[PDB]
Amino acid sequence: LTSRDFGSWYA
Amino acid sequence: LTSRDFGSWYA
Amino acid sequence: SLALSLTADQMVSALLDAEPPILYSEPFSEASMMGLLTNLADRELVHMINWAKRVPGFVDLTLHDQVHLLECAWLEILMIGLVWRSMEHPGKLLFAPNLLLDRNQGKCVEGMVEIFDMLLATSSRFRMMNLQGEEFVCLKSIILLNSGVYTFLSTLKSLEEKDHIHRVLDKITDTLIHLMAKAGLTLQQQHQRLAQLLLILSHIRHMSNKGMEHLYSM
Amino acid sequence: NSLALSLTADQMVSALLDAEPPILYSEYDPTRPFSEASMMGLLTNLADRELVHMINWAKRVPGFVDLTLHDQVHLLECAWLEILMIGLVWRSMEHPGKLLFAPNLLLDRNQGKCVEGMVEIFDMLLATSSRFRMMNLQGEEFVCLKSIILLNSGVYTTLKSLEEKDHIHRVLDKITDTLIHLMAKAGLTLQQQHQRLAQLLLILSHIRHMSNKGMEHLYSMK
Ligand SMILES: CC/C(=C(\c1ccc(O)cc1)c1ccc(OCCN(C)C)cc1)c1ccccc1
Ligand SMILES: CC/C(=C(\c1ccc(O)cc1)c1ccc(OCCN(C)C)cc1)c1ccccc1
């Protein structure tokens, strides 16, 4: 689990 | 005397 | 709103027009020095209230919101003013034309040398960027509108007030970019410099917070 | 071209994403019901574990380890609470009105009242969550802001001195290029790009404010 598993990402 | 009397200004 | 229909040149003119008087101060001890600084600040606060009412957008807010913004920003505004007028004096703080102090003298007030060093560092950063007065005046208006916006407070009106402030902040951004473009900066240089300027506001916040802590302690 | 200033915008984003720290779970022992830390102990324990990961993250940020050790420690000691806080806000954005300290420790505003003085700080973090939601802050933007906080917060607090401050400012400029590129690639106009960059940077002054208030509180409860 990191920040990359939360919220919206441009890509 | 104001800030205008100090430093550099673009104009 | 007057504010949102202003061109970049007209915003600059309005902010220049609004600039307050630079005051003259009326051995040292901690007591006397804080006395001088307190007296000068209290006089500058009178002029600051009238300045703030001349910042495009500010008068469109309720009197309650105007007071709140000034209560949050006032020390930041005094400090950025100080840094600006100290820019051409490496190693010194020009509190007034007749009160020019170096850091040795900051140590008069236990706790103040920390703050004095931070101010000098900001002054040195301004100098290192060759900050111009039009940019300084924009930054000062940003502090006014921005510093207390996240601690407003429950009504539709209030949400409408925040939207307004953000709209004006966007116009000040456009104005900075305009000044920089007119000064012959590349698009790349324009965004880099916009970032450099706005990042200094975090440091001005930090200094105001340390200042407020010191004032409360005493 | 593997050094920091040589990286393209895409390569910088990619490197920063690779360096993201783990999101920790709050430690729990079902066999120790009665020594469950107070609210403050739970947050302290979490934060201390996060700080170990933070040092290693910072030292993976391209450019950071080019600084002297003294300067690295300085920047870290200035930024650490801002960095915990922005990380907290990111992961809390999908939980309006709440703070996701950990996947197994999701707290509401009123739980902030468990520590005198803490609710003020919870309120400010919640307003940040709300600001980020209203902007539709994207992950790659959050990741650039963290690095900006690391490099910026202690820079303002002698030849090589100036040399090091010069290097920091160059890396900061590269991260600005990186933010702009992300926005440009997303199809924002130049005007929308400059307006958005400024909106994001102004939130950093609020994050500074929150960290100042938190440090004050921590130092009071010594
Ligand atoms: C950094 C200089 C300074 C003040 C100052 C800054 C800029 C300026 O143009 C004039 C003064 C300062 C000192 C005292 C002060 O008291 C205000 C109390 N009034 C509002 C009742 C305000 C600013 C100060 C602030 C806090 C602690 C120690 C010193
Ligand atoms: C606001 C949440 C918080 C902390 C926190 C923030 C984000 C996060 O992911 C985890 C915790 C907090 C609490 C305690 C703390 O102390 C660490 C002590 N070490 C450094 C010795 C740090 C942050 C806190 C900070 C200051 C005062 C009271 C509470």
What's the domain range around D65? 1-222
Q: Environment class of residue C147 by beta-carbon count within 10 Å: exposed (0-12), middle (13-18) or buried (19+)? A: buried
Report the CATH number that the domain containing residue D192 is assigned in CATH: 1.10.565.10
- The neighbour count for residue C62, using CB atoms within 10 Å, is 11
Helix (H, G, I), strand (E, B) or coil at C188: helix
- Establish how many alpha carbons lie within 13 A of residue D202's alpha carbon, considering only the half-sphere containing its beta carbon: 27
What distance in angstroms lies between residue D211's CA and the mean position of ligand 2's atoms?
Answer: 9
Q: Environment class of residue D192 by beta-carbon count within 10 Å: exposed (0-12), middle (13-18) or buried (19+)? A: middle
Helix (H, G, I), strand (E, B) or coil at A2: strand
The method recorded for this entry reads X-ray
Residue B8 backbone dihedrals phi, psi, to 5 degrees:
-100, 145
- Contact between D102 and D25 (Cβ < 8 Å): yes
Residue C101, strand partner residues: C93
Q: CA D3, D8, D12 angle in degrees (round to 5)?
A: 70
| Dist. CA C163–CA D172, nearest whole Å | 29
Tokens of C174: 């456009």
Q: Environment class of residue C57 by beta-carbon count within 10 Å: exposed (0-12), middle (13-18) or buried (19+)? A: buried
Using H for helix, E for strand and C for coil, what is the string for chain C? CHHHHCCHHHHHHHHHHCCCCCCCCCCCCHHHHHHHHHHHHHHHHHHHHHHHHCCCCHHHCCHHHHHHHHHHHHHHHHHHHHHHHHCCCCCEEEEECCEEEEHHHHCCCCCHHHHHHHHHHHHHHHHHHCCEHHHHHHHHHHHHHHCCHHHCCCCHHHHHHHHHHHHHHHHHHHHHHHHHHHCCCCHHHHHHHHHHHHHHHHHHHHHHHHHHHHHHHC
Atom of ligand 1 nearest to the CA of C44: 9
Tokens of C203: 């440091």
Chains B and A, touching by 3 or more CB pairs within 8 angstroms: no
| Mutate: best of A2, A5, A6, A9, partner D, most D CBs <10 A | A6
Question: Where chain C is broken, by preceding residue (C–N > 2.5 Å)?
Answer: 26, 153
Measured in angstroms, the resolution is 2.0
| Dist. CA C172–CA C144, nearest whole Å | 12
Among candidates C199, C32, C214, which has minimal Cα distance to C116? C214
D217 ligand 2 Cβ < 6 A = yes
What distance in angstroms lies between residue C76's CA and the mean position of ligand 1's atoms?
Answer: 10
Residue C130, strand partner residues: none
Among candidates C152, C161, C140, which has minimal Cα distance to C51? C140
Domain count, chain D: 1
Tokens of D34: 């009665």
- The neighbour count for residue D161, using CB atoms within 10 Å, is 9
Mode of pairing for the β-strands spanning D98-102 and C99-102: unpaired
Is some CB atom of chain A closer than 8 A to the CB atom of D17?
yes
Cβ–Cβ gap B10/C183 under 8 Å: yes
Chain C residues at the D interface, defined by Cβ less than 8 Å, are: 117-118, 121-122, 125, 142, 146-147, 150-151, 166, 169-170, 173-174, 176-177, 187-188, 190-192, 194-196, 198-206, 209-210, 213
Residue C132, strand partner residues: B8
Q: Environment class of residue C180 by beta-carbon count within 10 Å: exposed (0-12), middle (13-18) or buried (19+)? A: buried
- The neighbour count for residue D180, using CB atoms within 10 Å, is 25
Which residue, by CA, sits nearest to atom 14 of ligand 1?
C38
| Dist. CA D213–CA D211, nearest whole Å | 5
Is C85 labelled as part of a ligand binding site?
A: yes
As a whole number of angstroms, the longest Cα–Cα distance in chain D is 58
Among candidates C102, C95, C98, which has minimal Cα distance to C34? C95
D172 CB neighbours in chain C (<8 A) are 195-196, 199
The answer for residues whose C-beta is within 8 angstroms of residue D215's C-beta and 6 or more apart is D81
| Dist. CA D119–CA C2, nearest whole Å | 38
Cβ–Cβ gap C205/D201 under 8 Å: no
Which residue, by CA, sits nearest to atom 21 of ligand 2?
D48
Tokens of C185: 């900066």
- Contact between D190 and C190 (Cβ < 8 Å): no
Tokens of C70: 């000034």
Give residues 1 to 11 of A whose Cβ lies within 8 Å of D: 1-11
Helix (H, G, I), strand (E, B) or coil at D67: coil
Indicate the length of chain A as a whole number.
11
Tokens of C52: 């703030």
Q: What is the helix, strand, coil percentage profile of chain D, to 5?
A: 70, 5, 25
B2 CB neighbours in chain C (<8 A) are 19-22
Among candidates B1, D145, D202, which has minimal Cα distance to C176? D202
With residue C27 as reference, give the H or E element that holds it. Answer: none
Residue D108, strand partner residues: D98
Residue D46 backbone dihedrals phi, psi, to 5 degrees:
-60, -50
Quick one: which ligand is closest to C25's CA?
Answer: 1
| Dist. CA D176–CA D170, nearest whole Å | 10
Chains C and B, touching by 3 or more CB pairs within 8 angstroms: yes
Among candidates D31, D60, D65, D25, which has minimal Cα distance to D45? D25
Which residue, by CA, sits nearest to atom 27 of ligand 1?
C211
Q: Environment class of residue C125 by beta-carbon count within 10 Å: exposed (0-12), middle (13-18) or buried (19+)? A: buried
